[PDB]
Amino acid sequence: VTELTVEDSGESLEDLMAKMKNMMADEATRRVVSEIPVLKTNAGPRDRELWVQRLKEEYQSLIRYVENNKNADNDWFRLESNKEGTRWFGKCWYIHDLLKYEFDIEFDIPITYPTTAPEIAVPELDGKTAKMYRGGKICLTDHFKPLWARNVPKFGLAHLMALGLGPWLAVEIPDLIQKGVIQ
């Protein structure tokens, strides 16, 4: 009986070493982000004219993401900020049991954005879960804070949503529904 042994094709070592990395990256992440347009300007909120230009980029990114959400019927959030774009506020809509679940969310914009990501808060679900800092500041997967750092400064707030919050919802919210801390 022919036991499964390495058979030889016409691929070089590199054809392969490459093809490894096209299995060794996250397809989900790559899928998610491929759609979100990446940002350019490395400016933070004290950087005046440069900060505004980053801000236009942030708005463009978010727009195209909300717009991708609508296209795939996954319009799951709403956001806006003060004038200086340095302070943010919005709503997220989890569906679970064909039940809708709204939650109020709010984050600042660190001094050292875009290098340092912003810490989201959910001030109402404050206390009702275990992956949350005091006050309402969600604790994200370990994956994220490092992933963010490799891409700096290409990731912006739409990324912080689609990779950060977006995941954290599909975990906690199923959990708090069945635990009845929300109904």
Residue numbers in the entry: 36 to 218
Tell me what the authors wrote about this structure, in their words.
Analogous to ubiquitination, ufmylation is carried out by a three-enzyme cascade involving E1, E2, and E3 proteins. The E1 UBA5 has three distinct regions: (1) an adenylation domain that binds ATP and magnesium ions; (2) a UFM1-interacting sequence (UIS) spanning amino acids 334 to 346 that holds UFM1 in a trans binding mechanism; and (3) a UFC1-binding sequence (UBS) from 392 to 404 that binds UFC117–21. The adenylated UFM1 is then subjected to a nucleophilic attack by the catalytic C250 of UBA5 to form a thioester bond with the C-terminal glycine of UFM1. This is followed by a trans thiolation process, whereby the UFM1 is transferred to the E2 UFC1 forming a thioester bond with C116 of UFC1. However, UBA5 does not harbor such a domain but instead has a short sequence called UBS that is responsible for the interaction with UFC128.
Therefore, to gain structural insights about this region and how it interacts with UFC1, we attempted to crystalize UFC1 in complex with UBA5 347–404, but with no success. However, we successfully crystallized and determined the structure of UBA5(347–404) that is fused to the N-terminus of UFC1 to 2.65 Å resolution. The asymmetric unit contains one fusion molecule, and UFC1 interacts with the UBS that arrives from another asymmetric unit. As expected, the interaction of the UBS with UFC1 retains the same architecture as observed in the structure with the shorter fragment containing only the UBS sequence. In both structures, the UBS binds to the α-1 helix and β-1 strand of UFC1. However, for the linker connecting the UBS, we obtained electron density for residues 382–389 but not for 347–381, suggesting that most of the linker is mobile. V382 (the first built residue at the N-terminus of UBA5) is 35 Å away from UFC1 C116. While this distance is far from the active site, UBA5 residues 381–363 can span it, thereby we cannot rule out the possibility that the linker reaches the vicinity of UFC1 active site Cys.
